[PDB]
Design a protein around this motif. Structure first.
Motif, PDB file in Angstrom:
ATOM      1  N   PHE A 110       0.759  -1.239   0.000  1.00  0.00           N
ATOM      2  CA  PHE A 110       0.000   0.000   0.000  1.00  0.00           C
ATOM      3  C   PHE A 110       0.792   1.293   0.000  1.00  0.00           C
ATOM      4  N   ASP A 111       0.145   2.306  -0.551  1.00  0.00           N
ATOM      5  CA  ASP A 111       0.655   3.658  -0.640  1.00  0.00           C
ATOM      6  C   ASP A 111      -0.271   4.356   0.356  1.00  0.00           C
ATOM      7  N   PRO A 112       0.182   4.528   1.610  1.00  0.00           N
ATOM      8  CA  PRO A 112      -0.616   5.169   2.661  1.00  0.00           C
ATOM      9  C   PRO A 112      -1.293   6.455   2.210  1.00  0.00           C
ATOM     10  N   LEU A 113      -0.540   7.280   1.493  1.00  0.00           N
ATOM     11  CA  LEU A 113      -1.042   8.557   1.008  1.00  0.00           C
ATOM     12  C   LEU A 113      -0.448   8.857  -0.361  1.00  0.00           C
ATOM     13  N   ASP A 114      -1.310   8.931  -1.364  1.00  0.00           N
ATOM     14  CA  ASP A 114      -0.879   9.206  -2.721  1.00  0.00           C
ATOM     15  C   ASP A 114      -1.258  10.632  -3.096  1.00  0.00           C
ATOM     16  N   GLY A 115      -0.354  11.317  -3.800  1.00  0.00           N
ATOM     17  CA  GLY A 115      -0.604  12.681  -4.237  1.00  0.00           C
ATOM     18  C   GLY A 115       0.046  13.710  -3.343  1.00  0.00           C
ATOM     19  N   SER A 116       1.178  13.329  -2.768  1.00  0.00           N
ATOM     20  CA  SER A 116       1.934  14.181  -1.858  1.00  0.00           C
ATOM     21  C   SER A 116       1.982  15.675  -2.213  1.00  0.00           C
ATOM     22  N   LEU A 268       6.396   6.227 -10.874  1.00  0.00           N
ATOM     23  CA  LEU A 268       5.486   5.532  -9.964  1.00  0.00           C
ATOM     24  C   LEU A 268       6.018   4.162  -9.546  1.00  0.00           C
ATOM     25  N   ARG A 269       5.725   3.785  -8.307  1.00  0.00           N
ATOM     26  CA  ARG A 269       6.180   2.521  -7.747  1.00  0.00           C
ATOM     27  C   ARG A 269       5.296   1.330  -8.126  1.00  0.00           C
ATOM     28  N   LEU A 270       5.929   0.307  -8.681  1.00  0.00           N
ATOM     29  CA  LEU A 270       5.230  -0.891  -9.122  1.00  0.00           C
ATOM     30  C   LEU A 270       4.328  -1.553  -8.077  1.00  0.00           C
ATOM     31  N   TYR A 272       2.948  -0.728  -4.919  1.00  0.00           N
ATOM     32  CA  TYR A 272       1.788  -0.046  -4.368  1.00  0.00           C
ATOM     33  C   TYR A 272       1.080   1.019  -5.189  1.00  0.00           C
ATOM     34  N   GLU A 273       1.586   1.322  -6.377  1.00  0.00           N
ATOM     35  CA  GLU A 273       0.947   2.329  -7.220  1.00  0.00           C
ATOM     36  C   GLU A 273       0.486   1.778  -8.566  1.00  0.00           C
ATOM     37  N   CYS A 274       1.411   1.246  -9.356  1.00  0.00           N
ATOM     38  CA  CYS A 274       1.040   0.729 -10.674  1.00  0.00           C
ATOM     39  C   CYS A 274       0.153  -0.527 -10.686  1.00  0.00           C
TER      40      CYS A 274
HETATM   41 ZN   LIG Z   1       1.578   7.438  -4.447  1.00  0.00          ZN
END
Ligand SMILES: [Zn+2]
Ligand SMILES: O=P(O)(O)OC[C@H]1O[C@](O)(CO)[C@@H](O)[C@@H]1O
Ligand SMILES: O=P(O)(O)OC[C@H]1O[C@](O)(CO)[C@@H](O)[C@@H]1O
Ligand SMILES: O=P(O)(O)OC[C@H]1O[C@](O)(CO)[C@@H](O)[C@@H]1O
Ligand SMILES: O=P(O)(O)OC[C@H]1O[C@](O)(CO)[C@@H](O)[C@@H]1O
Ligand SMILES: [Zn+2]
Ligand SMILES: [Zn+2]
Ligand SMILES: [Zn+2]
Ligand SMILES: [Zn+2]
Ligand SMILES: [Zn+2]
Ligand SMILES: [Zn+2]
Ligand SMILES: [Zn+2]
Ligand SMILES: [Zn+2]
Ligand SMILES: [Zn+2]
Ligand SMILES: [Zn+2]
Ligand SMILES: [Zn+2]
Lengths: 328, 328, 328, 328
Positions: A110-116, A268-270, A272-274
């Motif tokens: 997981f990406d706890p918070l996306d869109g920093s 982007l990170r494979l 938790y994001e892609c």
């Molecule tokens: Zn993110």
């Protein structure tokens, strides 16, 4: 009076399979964490949650305050769900192994918070996750998080926009649930979502034109100057993967974060994001590629691995692939 | 325990002047409407507020359901404030004249709901307003809404993003208030906001490249390919004037919606979209222009008049003006 | 879409009079404080607001944590309203004089939190207030709070029950507003309330039977054993003056907290408990007495003065007075 | 950031047992219904939920609007939990048998809304439930709801007071969870609750003095006039079984609704009112009796059966039993 919560919905499906049900627990606990983040974000300025946390993650990102709170929230809830064994977060150097007493058969990335970049300007942000079922009996370890996206049994994201939404994709499809602030329940709002065959919107950061590759460059010109004298696609780029992707899903079109001359594997990170987005996109009749291979077929080698990602409407994504093919 | 609400804040300022106080009433009633819209938006999918209203405004826009609800909410609250006499809404053909019994000395122009294209994909949307003081004694009429933005005594916008924010600009400056969902009060969060002298972000819909004019075209290339070998600006375009502008305000940079070969006067509406933002932008040390004149100095001739608009950081906006000058 | 808030309602009335409007400000600021208390109470156990504050007020009460928070909240909001000059709280030894810069023509007496014994068991609690207009030009002082209840221009109470309600009584009548948690606005729900001529409910703490006086004793027996062979009154005693009184208002009946052999002046405080309720009760066609004189006609001599209080339905309160008369 | 929700708590316990987990589902679905009722009640006046439903239940009660909404909410959520087979509601003539497809091994008896008389005056109200495990293999039927309270595996109540609370009692004890309005989660606030050995509060409707029996009469006089010259008990009677009982639990003391000369079996209903409270009371070290037998040992013969009920602190309840014994 007959509320169709995500919980009722999920059991409603998993009923047939008749499993241990730790998935419904998993998602339930994920929903709790998602509600607290949503509530924290809704008052971040007043709560004094804006700013930096004073640290740098492996990806070199400048850790924010809401990254920490959301990271903790999610980590704790997943551990207390008695349904997970290995956890991978963008904010954690190594895989978090769940203590034996609370172990489950699920591996969650997981990406706890996306869109920093959009936290301080109140622009849509969210939480992305992917759930793999431990495909072994070996003692739980980071290796269990290095699976290809095709192995996801479920994935999705929480979207803290003008309304908080939870999009959930599983083997049979995609469904959107909206958080009712009144009772804190994600209500079904969009059943069995299907992205359209072709959109009229392209999203990508064009500030990287100098670093773009021949294929990306041509596709964009093609979007602005159609060869068939058709109307040019409109443009939209919120800046938070979660927000743009979700818009791609319900509006159709294409989202891109390709590689350039500075980054062979994009940004982007494979894990938790892609993959999550690629899973969601495919379960909705869409496509997700790197420009030369399906994002879900990539076998990871590093939990913080990056990968280029082009996703969205079938025909739009294919047109770009055809161009990458001509340039190869 | 010592809450700094927008109400306490405004009186705190207007205290010195010692006026009738109908402005504090005006803003109070505006805040009530802003909270109900925010609450409606937060549950639009569950509330079944998505879709079209079945009608077309003067600007030719396809009226949405949240346009109506928000339009009514705002119109009613302004009428009940006993502080307004003439009202202009993007959703109303003609100026709404307030019945004598509830008349006030203020003329308010507003965009009930901004960001129409982003309502269904949960992307940030909002409410824009401008407040003029009736500068005459003649019987109230639409003519009272046809003033240049320089005549605004106050203006701002409600931003329904991941958090609901109310940005208010007046003669002495700009301040951001955040809606505390707990008690429904806009709390001060950013005092005396000042946009930076120069940003590193440009926002505009590049889908209109073919219709862009020589100046816009050059500025963009310049943003992607800096002449001085400096890092290129990043790009961001949410799609809702309110969201991008607000980001410009707190992050610095530039936002553009110029005219093309299809539209001599751009697209955004002067009365309820450009002037408010131009006012906000100037009160924060920023600039707002059409490419050949200050947006606030334009004397309207039609309440639904359009105008090109380039705004944001001083140095960025000047650089573009210098280019428009070279091309003229 | 046409919300009838307390604010719209009050202006709607005070419109005719055309005053300075600092009352609407007063009530507005009172509503803000009332919403934060309501929100704090709604989560007191989770917020850790239960317990004692470690102090004793003049009345000898053991100060609670929510007394402090609510006391501060109310004191600050009243000071920032620019509408009050002298403030009297049950939690403050002496009258709080408002600093010149924020002075208004109103004197407010309040019980920050009523129903102390019911805070930890989630039983209804509230806030009681009385508003007097400074009837002099002398320098503001405690003397300005020592007026008879008949001098109140407005009064009421916030009721934090299963729903938060604000009951407001003024010269022309009583009205109940309910706090919409969604937008944090007190909506009108009961217009021009009138207590019935006679109820069938009596409320008083019968644990004090040994200390009751001959009159109280007889009235109670009469309630349990009707002389005319009619059905006996039902009994109800919540334990929070605010809750029982409010029930008296909408259900009719009688509420009593008379004096005994231990307390010549009963227990409830005249300034912030009895007068407000007596005012409310009278403006609704009801009666409020000590057993030998109208509570509103008592001229205070001490801001923390106590007074017996029997209130509610006309015929019920009269019947008790007739008994006190027979026993005198 | 480490939220201790009721869900985490329950699994935390049931972990050891390692059951099917349909109880955690049961309670989860019960919590959803409890949140919507709480939210509906919080705005009943504004929502127009006050009034009657136009019907009479078996007990002869005049069905209210919130009885229906709450009844439906609870019935639907229990059916969708895939954990119940037989349902008994005070608002339903006969036992509701769950359709095969959604059947579970649990039998739930519930009072959708308790405290009918206090809905319109914002006095605390709630929801009471008892959960039995189907102790047979016979085809599900009403007979499965006719078990003695001693057979309860869990029970409790939702309390919509100044704060919404969920009190849950199971084999090992009692725990109170408070509904955090922010994220809609019942947070643990009072762990392993134990009522004190003796209180100083007695609650009962004394309007029924003429119909009281010799025992009740003497106990009351004894409460007002202590034989040992000790301070008399204070009195409190909210009027909603849920509110008074809960206060008994955390404050200690005694609550009574005995039988009179008009009602041999008192008024409260055994299945959904007495047993739950009796279970809660016992799991907290308290007692619950009819005056001549333990409420939990009564074997029902009718799902809408009534039973006298005296509960609370051990020593207080024993003292009354000793009196009933002397009078027998
Ligand atoms: Zn993110
Ligand atoms: O500013 P850039 O380079 O366009 O990056 C934007 C991307 O950054 C992210 O925050 C990932 O770090 C995504 O949410 C978003 O799509
Ligand atoms: O899709 P386009 O042409 O870029 O228009 C976007 C603009 O439309 C608006 O909704 C105005 O109609 C603005 O909020 C936004 O900036
Ligand atoms: O416990 P007692 O003596 O009946 O006092 C109850 C009264 O106490 C108060 O809290 C005042 O202190 C009132 O709210 C309530 O009516
Ligand atoms: O008005 P009475 O007879 O005291 O009844 C009160 C009882 O009625 C109930 O509503 C049950 O019908 C309980 O909640 C409450 O304890
Ligand atoms: Zn990051
Ligand atoms: Zn992140
Ligand atoms: Zn429009
Ligand atoms: Zn609009
Ligand atoms: Zn607009
Ligand atoms: Zn006190
Ligand atoms: Zn008090
Ligand atoms: Zn009090
Ligand atoms: Zn009933
Ligand atoms: Zn009931
Ligand atoms: Zn009941």
């Amino acid at each position: 009076t007959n509320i169709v919560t995500l919980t009722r919905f999920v059991m409603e499906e998993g009923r047939k399979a008749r499993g241990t049900g730790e998935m419904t627990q998993l998602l339930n606990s994920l929903c709790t964490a998602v509600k607290a983040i949503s509530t924290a974000v809704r008052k971040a300025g007043i709560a004094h949650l804006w700013g930096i946390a004073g640290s740098t993650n492996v990806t070199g990102d400048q850790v924010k305050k809401l990254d920490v709170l959301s990271n903790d929230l999610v980590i704790n809830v997943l551990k207390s769900s008695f349904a997970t064994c290995v956890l991978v977060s963008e904010e954690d150097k190594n895989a978090i192994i769940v203590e034996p007493e609370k172990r489950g058969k699920y591996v969650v990335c997981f990406d706890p918070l996306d869109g920093s970049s959009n936290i301080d300007c109140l622009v849509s942000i969210g939480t992305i996750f992917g759930i793999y079922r431990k495909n072994s009996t070996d003692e739980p370890s980071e290796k269990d998080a290095l699976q290809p996206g095709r192995n996801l049994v479920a994935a999705g994201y929480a979207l803290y926009g003008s309304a908080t939404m939870l999009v959930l994709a599983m083997v049979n499809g995609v469904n959107c649930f909206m958080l009712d602030p009144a009772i804190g329940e994600f209500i079904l709002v969009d059943r069995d979502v299907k992205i359209k065959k072709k959109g009229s919107i392209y999203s990508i950061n064009e500030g990287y034109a100098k670093e773009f590759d021949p294929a990306i460059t041509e596709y964009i010109q093609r979007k602005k100057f159609p060869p068939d004298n058709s109307a040019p696609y409109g443009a939209r780029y919120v800046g938070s993967m979660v927000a743009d992707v979700h818009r791609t899903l319900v509006y159709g079109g294409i989202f891109m974060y390709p590689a350039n001359k500075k980054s062979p594997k994009g940004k982007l990170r494979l894990l938790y994001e892609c993959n999550p987005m690629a899973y969601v996109m495919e379960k909705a009749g869409g496509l997700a590629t790197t420009g030369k291979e399906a994002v879900l077929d990539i076998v990871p080698t590093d939990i913080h691995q990056r990968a280029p990602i082009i996703l969205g409407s079938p025909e739009d994504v294919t047109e770009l692939l055809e161009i990458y093919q001509k340039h190869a």
